[PDB]
Amino acid sequence: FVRTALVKGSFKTIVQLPKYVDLGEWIALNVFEFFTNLNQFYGVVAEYVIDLALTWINNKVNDKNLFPTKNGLPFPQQFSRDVQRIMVQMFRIFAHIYHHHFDKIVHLSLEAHWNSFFSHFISFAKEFKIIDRKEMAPLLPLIESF
Template structure:
């Protein structure tokens, strides 16, 4: 995905050589802005993410982004599978030492705050592009494990399923890999749409820009929640948990700073967000937020 020239002193894209694996340095990961570089080990999978037809029966040009109503509760199903006398174990990402591992120490507050003299919409656009780019790279690392037989539906925790909304308004359950491919393509198309993310001189951000941005962050959070609950062990095996935790602290701090996701959407990672807040790594929520 080629992207954007320098605007008001900020560059949304820089051309760099392709990398075959995530770097061992946080700066290496966060300074590579070429969104055409996916870290999928399977290059065919990489190509399918940004194509208009990923081999599924659903056309990506005709699918819609899930609405706020496209979250199904699996609570009743979960209750029948778990024994009431046993308490579910904590997810691995909540357990020590993993919950405290990070490459960047301290709070992200000063990093995500709107700099003086920088346009508000341009700051949102720049950070959205960067955070999307990094998420795509992380997903590329674990994409080969997200198979339809192992993940036949798109879930976060055991209580939440994300479903896809079709053009006729009906929602359908999709395998996790298909849902994520649809979501990545949908976000990529939004970011490359000049009517939403204008980059040419004289073009203004549309009145619907903030609504579009919030839709993108909802989709990014759903992919993040799926990875935390279903693939964190793989990131640990690859020694990437510090990179991933730092990325999420950056992501959620930006979300909190600009109020980009409704609180009910954050519920699958509520324990982690509370823990990061206690550690002082993220911007605190107001008491009435969660």
Template sequence: MSFLNTIRGFGRSSKKNREKETPNLEYQNPYASESATSVRGGASPTRRSPRRAAQALQVQFQAPAFQPPPRLKSTGDKKPLFLCEPFVKTALVKGSFRTIVQLPKYVDYGEWLALNVFETYTHLNQFYGIVAEYVTPAAYPTMSAGPGCDYYWQDGSGQAVMLPAGQYIELVLLWVSNKLNDQTLFPTKNGGAFPPYFGKDVKNMCRQMFRVFAHMYHNHFEKFVHLLLEAHWNSFFAHFISFVREFGLMDKREMEPLLPLIESLEQQGKVAV
């Protein structure tokens, strides 16, 4: 099966739903899909069964603990491909993504966060599916995000362990999927209320998804270029960063592995300062 078939549907928007939720926006979200309308219905958007993948890892599952990424070390090497011209400026649209992440009038705050987290997870899962077969333990023995930056997973005993990137990402996808399907956290029934700790869990989910972005930018961007998907990927990331900034879901130090790219997006006007 062609990898291009994996992401067929990117760019199609659910116009009916978008006009209902964001009637005054000039730009329609290029990543909204019909699956996004099912977030309040509790549907799981997984590319494949991450539960089986996690079982195969034989790692006792536990929610990942927060660990600030280590400060990147200067290596004197050339800039990574995603920071080079013309790729750093390649995008689907012009203008700031802040317009489409702002809370629409009459939309519940918790529902808006839930929808955006669901959509981010759905499309990140699809993008990972494009490169998943290349993320082998031999090729990527650590969850790296550039020179001097490796992420650790907290196992069931509370110990920080270094996992191959593929295992780490599969566990992240499983963890986020379980959160999305947790009725106590993401209620879908009429009258259900978001719990007091909802905001904290959303921050943790965004933090982990950012780590997947960081790994894929530093290690797999050339594959997106080869498939002519860099505009979709860059726009998706700019949308995500605009979302987490708009609602204060991540600290600047947590974004350090991709700060040069984020600063470039700011200069281009795609991400608000």
């Protein structure tokens, strides 16, 4: 519909990959959080009315090969590919939730929390350019506030 803009924090810094790290390990970390993040978010919204991909997300990250859980094992750099796909597993959830299911969410008036969280996911994406500006068609206008 919908709504926006109350707030938490400033500004945008954290998402950049720190120095001398396998980006893959680094990638692999962050990607996993966002998963659990929405999980906990949907769980208020839960019922009142992806399992695969989150698990396909799960199963990606829980693939030892694509995912150097272990040590300073680097990542296949198709892991760098495994993830570029693995990320996009995620935006599906945000949008629809935000598109259709935000409705409920705002009633909660926890909105300033989901706002920063959704805003969050973005910053990593475009700094790391993990997505195309064309597939951005559904979410385009809101971003334009900045």
